[PDB]
Amino acid sequence: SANEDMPVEKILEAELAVEPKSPNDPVTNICQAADKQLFTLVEWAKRIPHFSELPLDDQVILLRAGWNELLIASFSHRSIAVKDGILLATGLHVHRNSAHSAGVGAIFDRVLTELVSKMRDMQMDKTELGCLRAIVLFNPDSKGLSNPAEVEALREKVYASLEAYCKHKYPEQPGRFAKLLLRLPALRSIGLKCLEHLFFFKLIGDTPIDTFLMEMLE
Amino acid sequence: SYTLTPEVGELIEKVRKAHQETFPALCQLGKYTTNNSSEQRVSLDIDLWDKFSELSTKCIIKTVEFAKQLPGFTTLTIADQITLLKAACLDILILRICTRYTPEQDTMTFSDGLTLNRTQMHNAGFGPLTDLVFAFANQLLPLEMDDAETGLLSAICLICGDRQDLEQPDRVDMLQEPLLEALKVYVRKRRPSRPHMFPKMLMKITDLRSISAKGAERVITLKMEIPGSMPPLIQEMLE
Amino acid sequence: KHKILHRLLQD
Ligand SMILES: CCCOc1cc2c(cc1\C(C)=C/C=C/C(C)=C/C(=O)O)C(C)(C)CCC2(C)C
Ligand SMILES: CC1=C(/C=C/C(C)=C/C=C/C(C)=C/C(=O)O)C(C)(C)CCC1
C-alpha cells in the first residue's frame, strides 16, 4: 500500500530516536546546539526508509543540501509550547529579546511567527513533522545527484504516506496535507537567510582568532 | 474517481476566466520581436528597459484586475488587499511570464506579443535572475499546466495568510482553503494515473518564492543602475 | 501612499 512503501511509523521512530534529553551569547549557544544535532543527523537519515539504499554520494549531497532546514524544523516544532523563544537541543532556551540583542532578531522573528507559531496553531504532530523533514531530505533538485529520479520517487512516496496519514487521523480537515506542505516555503526561505549569516563561517581560508599576527611578530 | 462538485467547478471556472481575461495564453497571441541588443549580454539596455518597464506596469494593473475577481478578495480590508498584492506581485508576474516560454527558440513572450530571447531578457532588466527564471520555466513544462491550474496557483500565492502586517490573517487562510481544494481535485481529475502532480505542483511555490525574493533585490540594484526612476506603479508595488 | 493602487482597487 501507500504506507507500506514509506511507513509513517518508521519515520516517527527516526524522529524520536534523535530527540535529546546560559553563560555565552545567544548565537554561540545556537551554534553549540547545532553542532550537537549534526552528530545525530546522519543516524536520523539512516532511520529514514530507503535512504541508505541510495548511492553514498547522493546521501552526502542530500545531507549537505538540507542539514540547515532539517535542524531548524526540529527545534521549531520542539519550541511549540514556549512563548516568544526557542528550546535548544542542549536544554537551553533562547528568548526573543535575547536574539535581538545578539543582532539576529529579524530572522529569529521569522522563525517564531512563520515556523513555530504556525506549527502550534495547527497542532502539527511529530509524525507530520517527521514526514516534512523527510520530504526536505529527499530533495531531487540537489546539485550533483547521480540519480535525481530515484530521489523524486522517495519524496513522492512520502507525499502519499503523509496524505494518507492526514486523511486517516484528521478526516474533518480535507486540506491538512496541503496546509502542512505550505510550511516548506517559509522553512526554505528562513534556511537561506540563516546561511547568509554564517557566510564567513562557510568560506574560511585565512587565519581566525587572530593567530596570524601573534606569529607575525615572534 | 475525482468527481467535480458544482461548487468547486464554479470556483475553478471563476479563476480560469479571471486568468484568461487578464492574461492571454501564449498560443492565442500574435508575436513580434526586435533586432537591438540580441547579440551579447550587457548590464542594461535603456531602449529595452523602457519597453519592458511599460509592459510590467500594465501586467501589474492586470494582476490587480485578476485579484479583484477572486472570491472574497474584494471583501477583505483595503490594507490587507494591498498587503497581499505587494507581497505576491513578483510571484505572479514570474509564474505568468514563465508560461510564455518557448523552448525551441529560448524566448519569453509578453502580452503585447513582444518576444525576447534569453539575452534580451537579461539586457531588459532581469540580469542575474535571467538564468533562474528560464530554468524555472523549464521546470514547469513537465507539469503541462493549463489556464485553470496556472490561475489557481496564482490565486494560492496571492491569498496567503502567512504575510506580515496583515490585520485579519485567519480570514485570508479560510479564503485559501477552497482554492487549495479545487486545485487538488482538478489536478488529479486530469492526471488520474499520477496523483503526485498535486504536491509537486504545489511545491513549485517554494521555488517560486525564492526566485521572487531575489527579484525584490534586483529591483533595488536596477533602481541604482537605471537613469530615471521606477514607474510610479512599480514603486508603489515593490517598495 | 499607494495612490494609483487605491484607484485600481476602488473601481
Ligand atoms: C550552524 C551555525 C549557524 O546555525 C544557525 C544559526 C542561526 C539559526 C539557525 C541555525 C541552524 C542552521 C541550526 C540551528 C540548529 C539548532 C539550534 C538545533 C537545536 O537546538 O536543536 C537561527 C535560529 C535560524 C537564526 C539565528 C542564527 C543565525 C544564529
Ligand atoms: C517587475 C520588475 C522585475 C520583474 C519582471 C517580471 C517578472 C514581470 C513580467 C512581465 C509580464 C509578464 C508582462 C506581460 O505579460 O506583458 C525585475 C525583477 C526585472 C525588476 C524590475 C521590475
In angstroms and rounded to an integer, the radius of gyration of the C-alpha atoms of chain B is: 18
Question: Coil, helix or strand for B142?
Answer: helix
Distance (Å) from the alpha carbon of C8 to chain B's nearest alpha carbon: 7
What is the distance, to the nearest Å, from the Cα of residue B43 to the centroid of all Cα atoms in its chain? 24
- Distance from the alpha carbon of residue A108 to the mean position of ligand 1, in angstroms: 9
Closest residue CA from atom 19 of ligand 2: B126
Indicate whether residue B127 lines ligand 2 (CB < 6 A).
no
Q: Is B15 on the interface with C (CB under 8 A)?
A: no
Q: Are B117 and B133 in contact (CB under 8 A)?
A: no
Q: For residue B126, give the DSSP letter.
A: I
**Interface subset of B 162-191, CB within 8 angstroms of A:** 162, 164, 177, 180-181, 184
B33-53: burial string, b at 16+ Cβ within 10 Å, e else: eeeebeeeeeebbeebbebbb
Vertex B32: Cα angle to B27 and B38 (nearest 5): 120
| SS3 per-residue string spanning chain A | CCCCCCCHHHHHHHHHHCCCCCCCCHHHHHHHHHHHHHHHHHHHHHCCCCCCCCCHHHHHHHHHHHHHHHHHHHHHHHCCCCCCEEECCCCCEEEHHHHHHCCCHHHHHHHHHHHHHHHHHCCCCHHHHHHHHHHHHCCCCCCCCCCHHHHHHHHHHHHHHHHHHHHHHCCCCCCHHHHHHCCHHHHHHHHHHHHHHCHHHHCCCCCHHHHHHHHHHC
Starting at the earlier edge strand, list the strands of the sheet with B101-102: B101-102, B107-109, B115-117
Q: How far is CA A143 from CA A58, A97, A147, A217, in A?
A: 10, 38, 11, 44
Which residue, among A74, A84, A64, has the nearest Cα to A33 in the 3D structure?
A74
Q: What is the resolution of this structure in A?
A: 2.8
Which residue, among C9, A169, A57, A187, has the nearest Cα to B68 in the 3D structure?
C9
Let me know if A208 is exposed, middle or buried by CB neighbors in 10 A (0-12, 13-18, 19+).
exposed
| Upper half-sphere CA count for residue A196 (Cβ side, 13 Å) | 8
- Whether residue B111 is annotated as binding a ligand: the answer is yes
Q: How was this structure determined?
A: X-ray
> Are there at least 3 beta-carbon pairs closer than 8 Å between A and C?
no
Let me know if B70 is exposed, middle or buried by CB neighbors in 10 A (0-12, 13-18, 19+).
buried
Cα–Cα distance measured from residue B228 to residue B231, given in angstroms and rounded to the nearest whole number = 9
Torsion of CA A119, A123, A127, A131, to 10 degrees: -40
CB atoms within 10 A of CB A195: 13
Closest residue CA from atom 28 of ligand 1: A194
Which amino acid, A166? Answer: C
> Are there at least 3 beta-carbon pairs closer than 8 Å between A and B?
yes
CATH number at residue B40: 1.10.565.10
Closest partner residue to C2 among B61, B68, B82, by Cβ? B82
Which amino acid, B190? Answer: R
* Residue located via cell numbers 487538488: B184
* Residue located via cell numbers 546521501: A59
Question: Which domains does chain A carry?
Answer: 1-218 (1.10.565.10)
Which amino acid, B198? Answer: F
Cα–Cα distance measured from residue B120 to residue B145, given in angstroms and rounded to the nearest whole number = 26
* Residue located via cell numbers 519597453: B51
Q: Are A83 and A97 in contact (CB under 8 A)?
A: no
Torsion of CA B185, A115, B166, B148, to 10 degrees: -20
Q: Are A140 and B139 in contact (CB under 8 A)?
A: no
CB atoms within 10 A of CB B231: 15
- Distance from the alpha carbon of residue A34 to the mean position of ligand 1, in angstroms: 6
Full domain range(s) for residue B60: 1-239
Q: How far is CA B122 from CA B210, B222, B227, C8, in A?
A: 19, 12, 17, 30
> Which mutation among B20, B93, B132 tests ligand 2's pocket best, with the greatest number of atoms within 8 A of CB?
B93
Question: Coil, helix or strand for B1?
Answer: coil
Q: Are B89 and B237 in contact (CB under 8 A)?
A: yes
Cell output for A84: 516568544
What is the distance, to the nearest Å, from the Cα of residue B192 to the centroid of all Cα atoms in its chain? 26
* CA B23 to ligand 2: nearest atom: 15
Domain count, chain B: 1
Cα–Cα distance measured from residue A114 to residue B10, given in angstroms and rounded to the nearest whole number = 32
Note the helical H segments in B42-160.
Answer: 46-68, 78-97, 118-121, 130-140, 147-158
Q: What are phi and psi of A100, to 5 degrees?
A: -60, -45
Question: Coil, helix or strand for B178?
Answer: helix
What is the distance, to the nearest Å, from the Cα of residue B145 to the centroid of all Cα atoms in its chain? 13
B contacts of C7 (beta carbons < 8 Å): none
Neighbours of chain B (3+ CB pairs under 8 A): A, C
B contacts of C9 (beta carbons < 8 Å): 64, 68, 78, 81-82
The ligand whose atoms approach the alpha carbon of A79 most closely is 1
Which amino acid, A116? Answer: V
Cell output for A86: 526557542
Q: Is A181 on the interface with B (CB under 8 A)?
A: yes
Q: Indicate yes or no: CB of B64 within 8 angstroms of CB of C5.
A: yes
Closest partner residue to B205 among A159, A175, A185, by Cβ? A185
Indicate if the alpha-carbon torsion angle B137, B141, B146, B150 is positive or negative: negative
Q: Are B82 and C5 in contact (CB under 8 A)?
A: yes
Question: Coil, helix or strand for B231?
Answer: coil
Torsion of CA A61, A63, A66, A69, to 10 degrees: -170
